[PDB]
UniProtKB/Swiss-Prot annotation:
Domain of life: Eukaryota
Location(s) in or outside the cell: Cytoplasm; Endoplasmic reticulum
Species name: Homo sapiens
Role this protein plays: Serine/threonine kinase which acts as an essential component of the MAP kinase signal transduction pathway. Plays an important role in the cascades of cellular responses evoked by changes in the environment. Mediates signaling for determination of cell fate such as differentiation and survival. Plays a crucial role in the apoptosis signal transduction pathway through mitochondria-dependent caspase activation. MAP3K5/ASK1 is required for the innate immune response, which is essential for host defense against a wide range of pathogens.
Disulphide bridges: none
Name of the protein in question: Mitogen-activated protein kinase kinase kinase 5
Subunit structure: Homodimer when inactive. Binds both upstream activators and downstream substrates in multimolecular complexes. Part of a cytoplasmic complex made of HIPK1, DAB2IP and MAP3K5 in response to TNF. This complex formation promotes MAP3K5-JNK activation and subsequent apoptosis. Interacts with the 14-3-3 family proteins such as YWHAB, YWHAE, YWHAQ, YWHAH, YWHAZ and SFN.
Taxonomic lineage from the root: Eukaryota, Metazoa, Chordata, Craniata, Vertebrata
């Protein structure tokens, strides 16, 4: 019965994403909410499955019900408390972040980097979410990431520490000191081609951003795209980059750095509101080509505009403008839900267009069906 629930959660996380996953978890919950004894293995894998669709409200409500269930000892389950605080911090209703800190700070005060870094992230988020006015939260966040960094140096704590020093007005060391240590950690990790886990690539990206290393940023951003990085994770990297970009005081590849920053920030949006989409056109060479696309309110006939950002090969055609009557149609890829096929007249090939999220692709699909109907 336990094993059945566990096996079905794992199968659920593999088969489904989005709404389809939420349906499956609610089906599994009926069983979970009637189980003879509710163990921590079930709880943990439930919380991971809800995190896959950023359902922080379900995580909080489940963990609160375990706190009242007298025979579950929440205090003893530090990883469950970690995920609870994580969810409270992302949900951020009145008092959520206060409660997260009241959970996390006593757990820390041997403590692992992730625990120090979550507390640091709560402060970081308070700082960002205050429109950069909460300078006390900034300084508290810096101190927590600093402790992590000195206790167990990692790129994650190091980049977050540096970014908050940058926001505090750091011509300076710790800042160049954190910089030296970041460079030897990057040395330890080795070439980007051998880093396969999304979490290694994400922290490589961040330190590459801090280093102002353009080619690595572009390379690591693309790798983060190909790896189907979870939204929960990309969120935290993006937050770090937004703070960096706000506070840091052309290079011929600036255009591709701007594209990738725009792509990865757009990828954390759940409400799609954009005049234009940063996209990757998959070429028959099997290279993803950074591009922009827009659906234009043009007089007489609506149009689709598509253009390459900084193509390596500057020769040939890198811009298209299609009138509504020029479009045969659109089809979402049967294999890649981020991808929409666009079919146009007098073009024997197609455009295989890859968006930053599934929803962005679906919006494009719907808008093109509207102009062709």
């Amino acid at each position: 019965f336990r094993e059945s629930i566990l096996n079905d959660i794992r199968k659920a996380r593999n088969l489904y994403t989005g709404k389809e996953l939420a349906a499956e978890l609610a089906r599994i919950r009926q069983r979970v909410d009637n189980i003879e004894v509710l163990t921590a293995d079930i709880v943990i894998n439930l919380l991971l499955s809800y995190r896959d669709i950023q359902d922080y409200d379900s995580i909080v409500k489940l963990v609160e019900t375990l706190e009242k269930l007298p025979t579950f000892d929440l205090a003893s389950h530090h990883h469950v408390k970690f995920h609870y605080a994580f969810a409270l911090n992302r949900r951020n209703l009145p008092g959520d972040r206060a409660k997260a800190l009241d959970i996390m700070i006593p757990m820390v005060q041997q403590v692992a980097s992730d625990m120090y870094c979550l507390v640091g992230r709560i402060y970081k988020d308070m700082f960002l979410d205050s429109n950069f006015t909460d300078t006390e939260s900034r300084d508290h966040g810096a101190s927590w990431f600093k402790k992590a960094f000195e206790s167990e140096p990692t790129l994650q704590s190091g980049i977050n520490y540096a970014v908050l020093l940058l926001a505090a007005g750091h011509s300076s060391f710790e800042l160049r000191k954190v910089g030296v240590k970041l460079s030897s950690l990057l040395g330890k990790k080795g070439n980007l081609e051998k880093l396969q886990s999304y979490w290694e690539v994400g922290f490589f990206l961040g330190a590459s951003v801090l280093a102002n290393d353009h080619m690595r940023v572009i390379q690591a951003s693309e790798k983060l795209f190909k790896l189907k990085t979870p939204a929960w994770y990309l969120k935290s990297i993006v937050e770090t980059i937004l703070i960096y970009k706000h506070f840091v005081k052309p290079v011929a590849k600036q255009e591709l750095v701007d594209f990738w920053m725009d792509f990865l920030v757009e990828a954390t949006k759940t409400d799609v509101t954009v005049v234009r989409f940063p996209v990757l056109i998959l070429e028959p060479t099997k290279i993803y080509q950074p591009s922009y696309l827009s659906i234009n309110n043009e007089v007489e006939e609506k149009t689709i505009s598509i253009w390459h950002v900084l193509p390596d090969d500057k020769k040939g055609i890198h811009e298209w403008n299609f009138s509504a009557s020029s479009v045969r149609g659109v089809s979402i890829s049967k294999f890649e839900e981020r991808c929409c096929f666009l079919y146009v007249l007098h073009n024997s090939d197609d455009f295989q267009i890859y968006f930053c999220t599934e929803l962005h692709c679906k919006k494009f699909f719907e808008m093109v069906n509207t102009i062709t109907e």
